[PDB]
């Protein structure tokens, strides 16, 4: 888990190979690509309450707002199952209303 210790990117596994006076490591790593721009908000005010994502982040393609995981684009509809509530929408700086 320690970053950049073995391989550049998110580490997956490694394979050893013998050398005449040393060792050779083959590191397998995961590298994301083909990024896209999106609009973001930190929480959603619904019925006067504030909703935060359990795991993920809010995005929108112009409209309708979705929750995604942070390392791979996969939008899902926002539901009470993958969000949790905390207080009212009065102190968060950046609330959008959906």
């Amino acid at each position: 888990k320690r970053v950049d210790f073995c391989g550049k990117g998110y580490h997956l596994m490694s394979f050893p190979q013998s050398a005449p006076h040393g060792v050779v490591f083959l590191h397998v790593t995961y590298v994301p690509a083909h990024e896209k721009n999106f609009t973001t908000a930190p929480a959603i005010c619904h019925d006067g309450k504030a909703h935060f994502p359990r795991e993920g982040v809010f995005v929108s393609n112009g409209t309708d707002w979705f929750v995604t995981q942070r390392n791979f684009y996969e939008p899902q509809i926002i539901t009470t199952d993958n969000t949790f509530v905390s207080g009212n929408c009065d102190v968060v700086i950046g609330i959008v209303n959906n």
Partner: protein, 50 residues
């Protein structure tokens, strides 16, 4: 005997130079260890959360 005197001077100066070089090598090894530690710290704590 000028050769003898110059030989004494030569061996003294050569010994001093050898001592200086050895001390430099030891200090360089220590500095290299410190630099490796710095590189690891900067890779692990600046580019990510530890």
């Amino acid at each position: 005997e000028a050769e003898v005197q110059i030989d004494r001077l030569i061996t003294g100066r050569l010994q001093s130079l050898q001592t200086y070089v050895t001390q430099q090598l030891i200090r360089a090894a220590e500095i290299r260890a410190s630099a490796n530690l710095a590189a690891t710290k900067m890779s692990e704590c600046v580019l990510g959360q530890s």
